Each structure stands twice: as C-alpha cells, then as structure tokens.
C-alpha cells in the first residue's frame, strides 16, 4: 500500500516532490485525454459523414461503370487486368500532428508514367470509358480521404486508451501509494523525533538530579 523507502528528512522531501510531479502529470494527462477525446468525437462524426458520402460515390461510380460497359458492349475487366503493369494513383503517408498525437494522414498522388488507361482496344464507347475512369478516380480519392480519416481514428483511439489507462493508473495507484508513503515517512520521522525528545528528557533529568545532589 506504500513504497518501501527508508524514512529520512531528504527522502520525505523527495517523495513530496514525487507526489507533486505525479499530481501535475495526472492533471496534464487528463487535459490531454479530454482534448484528444473532443477530437475523437469530431473524427467519429467525420467518419460517419465520409462513410455516407463514400457509399453514395461508390453507387454513382458503379452506375457509371455499368453504363460504360453497356456502351462498350463487353466487360473491360479483362483489359484492365491485362493493363495492370503499374498504378497511376499512389498514396503517400503524411504524419500530421493533430493535438498531442501525430496520427498519420494518407495523401494521394498521381503518377503519369502509366497514366494511360485501357481506352485503346476497347472497341467503342471511348468517351464513356473516359468518364467512368474520371468518376472512379474521384471515388478513389474520396475513399483515400476516408481511409486516412479511418487510420487517424484508429491511432487516436489507441492513444486515448493508453492515456486514460495512464491517468487511472496514476490517480489510483501512484497518487495513493505516494500519499501513503508520505504518511508513513512522516510518522516514522515523528517517532524518531519523539525518541530524541525522550533521550534528551532523560539527559535533562539526570543533569537536574546531579545539580540537586551537588
């Protein structure tokens, strides 16, 4: 229930400083948890909105792809799979510092080396294929933003969990153990002071008796 520290005048001061530091850390960590939790509710609302928007965009892109396939008269899936040597779109992670944490946010990019699509050799419906490709690229950008927000959500949830765990651990173990150690050290110092007082009282009584005899 308390730290096994040998009582001392310096040890009492060191443990009082440790208690003050633990209280300060507990207050600052609670403030950090509160701020991160406010950002967490904001991120959850953004995730819900982005999920709805991504569903709508995916439905629109599916409709556009179906229209393009109908115009072309055949499935362009085989051609797309054949022309999959390199990816025109790439995502580079960016370590944005949101509040106290540094949760990463993905950033999309376009590579023009293999930017050519499967429009050639599709037979017909080149304009429809281009429109479907543009819609799919827009939906991919929206999904990349949603995935970046999702990763930020996961990282922020982990950081909030560990921060609240540390806050509860401090407030329920470190502060009580340090306070009990302070009380025990103060009690032991009081006992030592009482022993010294009693020894000095014996010395004084002996001196008084000797003076009375002489």
């Amino acid at each position: 229930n308390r730290e096994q520290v040998f009582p001392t005048r310096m040890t009492l001061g060191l443990m009082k400083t440790k208690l003050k530091g633990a209280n300060q850390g507990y207050s600052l960590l609670k403030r950090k948890s509160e701020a991160l939790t406010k950002r967490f509710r904001d991120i959850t609302k953004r995730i819900d909105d982005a999920k709805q928007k991504m569903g709508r965009v995916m439905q629109t892109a599916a409709f556009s792809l179906a229209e393009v396939s109908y115009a072309t008269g055949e499935n362009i899936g085989y051609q797309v799979q054949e022309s999959v040597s390199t990816a025109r779109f790439k995502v580079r992670a960016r370590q944005e510092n949101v509040s106290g944490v540094y949760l990463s946010q993905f950033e999309s990019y376009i590579d023009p080396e293999i930017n050519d699509f499967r429009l050639t050799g599709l037979g017909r419906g080149g304009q429809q294929v281009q429109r479907a490709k543009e819609i799919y690229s827009r939906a991919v950008e929206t999904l990349v933003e949603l995935a970046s927000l999702q990763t930020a959500f996961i990282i922020l949830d982990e950081v909030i969990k560990v921060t609240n765990r540390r806050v509860n651990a401090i407030e329920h173990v470190i502060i009580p153990r340090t306070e009990n150690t302070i009380a025990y050290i103060n009690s032991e110092l009081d006992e030592l002071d009482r022993e010294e007082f009693y020894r000095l009282k014996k010395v004084q009584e002996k001196k008084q008796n000797e003076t009375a005899k002489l």
Binding site: R165, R166, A169, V173
Partner: protein, 189 residues
C-alpha cells in the same frame, strides 16, 4: 530494532506478509523478502536424496520473481500487451501461489507435507510450466491451449489432496501417473 537485530544474527528469514495473512493465504511467507542462507550448504543432502530439488526451487523462485515483475507491470499497463510466455508465467505462478506455496495447516492432506511429496509437487508444477512454455513456443495459442489442458491444470492444482498417510511409495505412484497424464494431454493438444 528487534527485527533488524534478529535479521543480522539469524540465517533464515521467513518474512510474513499480512496481505497474504488476510485472504487466508497461509503460510503467508513473503517470497520476495524471505531468504535462507542454508540453501548452498543443503546441496549435499539434496544431491544425496533429491538431486533436482535445488534446481526446481531455483526455477520456482525465477517463476515467482518474473510474475511479480509482470504483475507490477500489469497493474499499471493492463494485461493485454503481455506475450504468451508472460501469460504462461503469470498463470503458472498464480497456480503455484494458490496450490503449492499455500498449505492449509489444519486440513488432513496438507497438515504435514513431507519432503518427498513437496519434491513431487515441485516436479509437477515445474513440468507443467515447462510443457506450457514448450507447447506455446511450438506455436499454440495460449488461450485455446489452456482451455484444452484445463484438465491437467486442475490435476496439478489438486496435487495437494494426495494424503501423505498413503505412504511414500503410494503417493509417488500417484505423482508419477500425474506427470504421464500431463505430457499426453499437452501432446494431444
């Protein structure tokens, strides 16, 4: 001052913890602070009678110390981050503290646990820990492994009830079958 002087003069320190005195964990010997300076000089008797006894007690001390450190970690940072080996260490140390170390002094079975029964019990607990560690190192998930080998774990936890009045031979026969029934169950899972 009396305690400090007695610790200075004596050679064996059976420190009792009131935390274990409560919750009826007797004997309440505090394994952390307790020591015995006759461990080394008893090596002759142990080599004569029970050669593996010092090795088993060293292994039990290592398990208990590792679990004490892991529990000090867990009480602050939760038990989720632990590895499967740490899970095994904590589980087997709880088993040791609840079955082997704790000995009810007013029950017929554990009123007097002689040296041969104690040695066989150490063999059982250490072999259970080693089998769990080996089976998890082979790749088994510890949760499913414990669910499967709960029978062996409870057989080890029930080793206390082997009455020493049955005799050295009869009790040793019951412990020999315990180890054989332990390896097969862990091999099966």
């Amino acid at each position: 001052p009396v305690t400090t002087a007695t610790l200075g003069i004596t050679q064996v320190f059976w420190g009792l913890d009131k935390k274990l005195a409560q919750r009826k964990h007797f004997p309440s010997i505090n394994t952390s602070v307790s020591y015995s300076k006759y461990t080394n000089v008893l090596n002759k008797f142990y080599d004569s009678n029970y050669p593996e006894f010092p090795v088993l007690r060293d292994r039990m001390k290592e398990i208990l110390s590792n679990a004490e450190e892991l529990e000090q970690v867990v009480q602050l940072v939760g038990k989720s981050a632990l590895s499967d080996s740490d899970k095994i260490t904590l589980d087997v140390a709880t088993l040791i503290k609840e079955d082997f170390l704790q000995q009810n002094g007013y029950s017929t079975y554990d009123a007097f646990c002689p040296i041969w029964k104690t040695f066989d019990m150490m063999r059982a607990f250490i072999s259970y820990h080693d089998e769990a560690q080996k089976a998890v190192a082979n790749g088994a998930n510890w949760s499913k492994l414990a669910d499967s080998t709960g029978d062996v774990k409870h057989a080890v936890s029930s080793s206390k009830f082997f009455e020493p009045s049955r005799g050295e031979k009869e009790v040793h026969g019951e412990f020999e079958k315990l180890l054989s029934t332990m390896q097969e169950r862990f091999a099966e899972s």
